[model samples]
Target chain A: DIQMTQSPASLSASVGETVTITCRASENIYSYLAWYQQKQGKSPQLLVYNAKTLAEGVPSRFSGSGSGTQFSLKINSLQPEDFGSYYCQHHYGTPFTFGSGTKLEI
Target chain B: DIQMTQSPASLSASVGETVTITCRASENIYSYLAWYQQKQGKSPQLLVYNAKTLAEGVPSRFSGSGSGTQFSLKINSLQPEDFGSYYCQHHYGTPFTFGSGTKLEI
Candidate 1:
């Protein structure tokens, strides 16, 4: 199983501030990665997929980048609604795994 | 985007009981469903994928079934560790969508 090590388990940022979360995979996973956001008591919402492609309806401020074993989600000018837990998932292999998660708070 | 509706927003079950959670998609997903378990304060973990294939390291007590627009995750003889939130996701298309989620408690 591939392990995804995410950094900054918790973060505190104000609205309009830019924040970035990083995820490093155990092995090369090409660009088959996705980023998701989950608010309290809610299902995760897809933010980015295929490495850098923003999901439908996602704001332009949210973007993803990187390839191989490294990927990152960058939220430019974050909004109040962006304060939540963020995770990275790899779909390149079986038993798809997710990052430990980064909790963004205001 | 496909919408996913999950039944029984919350359920209470004993350790030795069996519990089933259902998910219905707005359109056919061609058995491209996946189930995940999320413990409080933790990242969601994959349990079943491709409708019926159990992910690696997941116990045999957990199983998935159904096709097309409907799917289900069944936990036989639920355990204490199984008490959490369960979500079903459709991976058949872009902007992969997930159900509202079902909370399981002991």
Candidate 2:
């Protein structure tokens, strides 16, 4: 299983502002990373997959980038509803691992 | 995207009691279901995958079973540390979806 490390454990952003959350894979995951967002008492919602592909129905402002061992999830013009926690996971192998998570506060 | 309807949105059980959480998929998901446990203010940890395959390092008390569109996670004897939320995710399709979640309390 690959270990995932994410930065900015917690962040504060204002509406219309932008923020980036980073995720590093223990080994080359070949761009099989995905990003998810979760709000209080809610299930995680997919934002980006396969490194940079936005999941269907995800707003264009929510984008992803990077390849290999490094990846990022960028939310542009953040909205009030975006206040929550974000996580990144690698699906390159079994025992899929996820980052500790980054909390987005308003 | 598939819809996962999880039952018993919340549950209360004694430390030595067995508890089960169920997830029903809107469509047949084969056996691509996975279960995760999340403690308050912590990242989720994989418990079971491929329906019944236990993840490495997880306690034997936590088991999963079921097939097709119905699946469940059973904890033989719950522990204090097990008081948290549990979720079921489907890996059978793109844009994977997760169940609303089941919160276990004292």
Candidate 3:
């Protein structure tokens, strides 16, 4: 199982402001990384997969990038609804691993 | 992209009770499904993968089974810590999809 590390466990951002979160894999995972967003008391929704491809229905403002052992999720302009927690996971191998998560607060 | 529909959106069970959650895919995805458990404000933890394979460190009380497009996660004699949200994910195709999710509460 590969370890996933996410930075700044929490953050505060204003609506329409650009924000970024990072995830680092313990080892190379090719580009099989994905990002997800979860609001309080709700299920997680997939935002990006395979590094940069946005999942169907995801907003264009949410973008992802990186390969090998590093990845990042960027929100071009945060929305009030985006105030929640985000997580990154690696799907390159079995027992897929996830990062601790970053909480986005308004 | 495959759409996964999960059932019994929410359930309430006491500790020591057995419970099950189901996920069905819109199309055949073989047995490439995985299960995750997420507690409030915490990142999800992988529990089962490849349909029925238990992820490392997951307890025996948690088991999975399914084929084709339907999958289920069963927790025998659930523990107090088991109260949370469970989600199923399919890795058989690009843009790996996830079920809406099931929440287990007190």
In model 1, where do residues sit more than 4 Å from their true spots? Answer: A1-106
Residue B102 of model 2: what lDDT? Answer: 73
CA lDDT, every model vs. true structure: 0.82, 0.81, 0.81
The digit string of per-residue lDDT tens for model 2 on A1-106 reads 7888775466554566556677878799988999999999899998899999998899889989989987878776678888898999998998887897877776
Q: Residues B1-106, candidate 3: write the lDDT tens digits.
A: 7888775456555565555567778899999999999998889899999999998999999999989977788777678888888899998988997787777776
Residue B79 shift from truth in candidate 1, angstroms: 0.6
The Cα error of candidate 1 at residue B71, in Å, is 0.6
Q: For model 2 chain A, where is the 10-residue window of minimal lDDT? A: A8-17
Winner by lDDT between candidate 3 and candidate 1? 1
Q: Which candidate is the best by lDDT?
A: 1
Fnat per model, in the order shown:
0.00, 0.00, 0.00
Which candidate model has the greater lDDT, 1 or 2? 1
Candidate 2 docking quality: incorrect, acceptable, medium or high: incorrect
> Can you give the DockQ of every candidate in the order shown?
0.01, 0.01, 0.01
True-structure Cα RMSD, model 3: 19.4
Clashing residue pairs for model 3: none
